[PDB]
Amino acid sequence: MWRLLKLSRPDLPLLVAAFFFLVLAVLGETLIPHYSGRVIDILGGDFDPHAFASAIFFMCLFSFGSSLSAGCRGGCFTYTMSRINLRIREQLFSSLLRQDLGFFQETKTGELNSRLSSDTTLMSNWLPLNANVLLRSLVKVVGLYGFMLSISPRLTLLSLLHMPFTIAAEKVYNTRHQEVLREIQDAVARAGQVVREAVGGLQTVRSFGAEEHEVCRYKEALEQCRQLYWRRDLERALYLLVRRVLHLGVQMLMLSCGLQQTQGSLLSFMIYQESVGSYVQTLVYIYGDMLSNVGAAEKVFSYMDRQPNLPSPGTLAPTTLQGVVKFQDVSFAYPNRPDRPVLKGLTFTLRPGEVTALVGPNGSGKSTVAALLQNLYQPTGGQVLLDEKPISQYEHCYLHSQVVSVGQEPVLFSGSVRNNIAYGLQSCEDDKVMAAAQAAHADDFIQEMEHGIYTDVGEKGSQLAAGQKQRLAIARALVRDPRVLILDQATSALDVQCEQALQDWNSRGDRTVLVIAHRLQTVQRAHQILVLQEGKLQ
Amino acid sequence: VRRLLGCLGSETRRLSLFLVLVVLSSLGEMATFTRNLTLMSILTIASAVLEFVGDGIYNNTMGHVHSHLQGEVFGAVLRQETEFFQQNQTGNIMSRVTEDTSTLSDSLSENLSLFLWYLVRGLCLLGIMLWGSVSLTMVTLITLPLLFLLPKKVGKWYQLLEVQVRESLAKSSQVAIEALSAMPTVRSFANEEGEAQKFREKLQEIKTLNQKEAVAYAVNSWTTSISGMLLKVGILYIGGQLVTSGAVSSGNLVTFVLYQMQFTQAVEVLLSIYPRVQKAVGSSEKIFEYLDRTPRCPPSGLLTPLHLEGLVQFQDVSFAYPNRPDVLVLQGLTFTLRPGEVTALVGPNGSGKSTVAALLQNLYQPTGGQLLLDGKPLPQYEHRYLHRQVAAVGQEPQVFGRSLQENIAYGLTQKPTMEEITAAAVKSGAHSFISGLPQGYDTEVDEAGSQLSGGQRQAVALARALIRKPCVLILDDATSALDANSQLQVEQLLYESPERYSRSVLLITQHLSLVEQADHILFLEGGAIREGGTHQQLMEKKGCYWAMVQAP
């Protein structure tokens, strides 16, 4: 596929070198038979030690040169293929990160990782295992072709004639084969997703004692994959049998012509024709196999060129931001489940230096408001304005530097406490991370850790208590000094004393604060209170 | 190498038939118009049919072997202890289970047939050479083992290199999985570039290893070709000198070298196989370590009593996590849960409450003291029985990517009727919003449960716990995301439901207003119990609990 060759373009010098080495290997292999014939002839009668040593010497010399060239060729092709694999992985993963957040609910993470792991190998692995033997036999096959052409040109033309059903059978086989490969990859992805879900949430599984059920599910997926593999293998074997039968038909056609026809040479001409035909059929089969393998990986190419459902990027990066946020008749419905509105005609204004509290029952749409503020989703009606300009017109890094949120259930990453505080900062000094840890009251438990600020926080923060993880999320928010701060239930896991101590969110009076909570304790001190019920302001 | 061949013991009855077919085909290959035309057609048809049958049998057997191996590896993975999954992260385990086994199976299927075919053909050629001449073929057999010395010396290289390649691939897979999950957090901090840089840093190691693999492949190709050339030329030379002395014949030597040509070709192929076998041995090290690992946790018991009270006794329980055994998280806990009563466990963050909840679920074993359910240790009960009698909600509940009907009924052996699921949803308070969904209880949720709100997810998690009718119920901060109205459901479930007499409840929360009606209150700080008693008793003490309540 021409797209994949364009992707392979940086590897061109290696392919050129490999082609040169292949040419040298063929040219060297042309000479070994000559001197081997002299060795055989001198051994078989008319013995002469002077010629014998010379013939053996040249045989050894050209075998040695051909061996070295072949080894270099093989190394070059292997390295080129591996580099192409790694480039495919890099570009696919880079493309996935760009996508809109709806994409990751339509797809599943285990399937995406299965794509990255598996589908790239199909498109990368163009070459069979035994290709070196196939190449080394080329000169012998050409020599056999020379014999049968001179012995009987007529029957050679009859051999060159293609079989009546050879073309259709190959097309049908390729069309079926590509579809079977695609189905196999889909089944593999589903099994990978099953394993991903089983392993990721294992503590719940063991709490309910449902390991055997997961094992049964995985075994069922494996059975489906096995059935697909068996179907592919059986179809390939049947195609090979049919191709051999067609070759046999062509064979006696010319056997008939040869018997019609120069005496005693039919015993030797048949062998050469059979060998040459087998070699050419194998070459055509390899070409078709490579074509089908590239064709089966179409979903990787699909993910590598999907344009996300996002507005064009934003130029704006002001030197100073006033931090006034305005909602103007905002209506929203999630892209995966439209026609079911969540927010209906919201309109409110947040001003710097004042604390706003948003309250409402479960499912009212408070986290939806928090997500619209951060430009994670686009409103389906109205506008969201920051400093009297649309939120989507600001630069990505600048916007998510000025506007910062603490999520409902904070997610941390495997790595140090220094890397979870100061996540996404290009550079952040020891002093700012300690000041942010002190501001969030996180520093008390950080000293008791074995390696302080350098201690490994486990995967998803699984090696911390809930309140500790919550405080590290608060410190991750505060280390940036945001102009607009959003707190989506930031004190749910904290004890009453730590919750009380953290109430003074904007004592300096220089930033906009939005507080989302259920408890009335954190909403009594707010300047403005907004009540949200069924997606409408009350 | 015997470890790889150990898994093939269940397919001997078929691989022997495949071997018989291949040897028959090899022997057949080695050994008026109407009369001449029919024989060739019959011979070709016989050869094609034999090849077709052999390939079919071999492919079916290899597919069965692959499926069985993958299933066994996953089953062995799921048996490990709880702390095994903190040392190994999700992406690493997934890559080991789903990718190493496939590579091993592919290598085995690609190499076994080639080995058997060329071995049989080499044996046939060796027999023909034995017929041609005895001395020269004996010389060939003498010099043949010298060619395998270089592969034997080098082989450990391929194992050590392939192990590193697999490790780097697993690390890259872990990075990719951890980045692709929790995408809103990456997006909201504009950190896509950091994740891409991490992934590229993992790709660089694989690139560095691939360079070495390519160089080793080229060197091995050189060595194999030179070994074949030397083996051929040595015999050719000794024969060309022996013929001059007249002790042999010209035609016999010509035939012998003509067959020696093909014997050396087969020898070259068999030499080519060995490094691939070493690579395969190297690639399967981790999965076989998984298979042969001994779990560091007591196995399941046998007891499944018909009558169980739900009486839980802690007797001087202390615990320290295996990844940091030097620090004790709990110190000498001693309390009893009795049916028909609610016991509240309160204290600052990081005090160990969730650790107590995890111990009570038999996820970890105490380092000291005893933990008894109705007078007998937890490991004496059968697994699926014990985890029906004891159920918990969890501090940040996790749901799976299935329908709401399956999420509530998760883990049960026999499927409950829709009437029971509706009752559980009503008791947990989740029935109000489920009925509003267009598909009702058949609504599919995403793998992270992100399509639900926090309170809705928590209500589903509570319904999942109630449907089992447990005798011991653990509410680990189950009221965190519930709004004002939904807290009344939990209050009625705890203190007013008519089923409260059949079970004992352990209530863990930071919402101390829910604790006032508890029969017993335990104050846990620093991993040790400081105060205990009812609400009024602790209020009259003016101690830690009173100070915590009077904090505002």
Ligand SMILES: Nc1ncnc2c1ncn2[C@@H]1O[C@H](COP(=O)(O)OP(=O)(O)OP(=O)(O)O)[C@@H](O)[C@H]1O
């Ligand atoms: N990714 C999604 N796709 C579809 N619907 C969604 C998605 N995320 C949330 N919803 C739905 O949108 C509605 C609003 O949810 P949201 O989390 O904004 O409410 P909330 O008031 O913050 O809830 P809570 O108080 O429980 O945190 C709910 O009905 C929820 O199920």
Ligand SMILES: Nc1ncnc2c1ncn2[C@@H]1O[C@H](COP(=O)(O)OP(=O)(O)OP(=O)(O)O)[C@@H](O)[C@H]1O
């Ligand atoms: N996997 C782990 N390995 C090591 N230490 C851990 C692990 N999980 C938790 N801890 C530590 O054990 C202690 C108790 O944590 P735990 O979650 O049980 O406390 P908690 O009282 O429930 O806290 P919270 O009120 O915040 O939920 C803490 O110091 C915590 O960091």
Ligand SMILES: [Mg+2]
């Ligand atoms: Mg919310």
Ligand SMILES: [Mg+2]
């Ligand atoms: Mg806890």
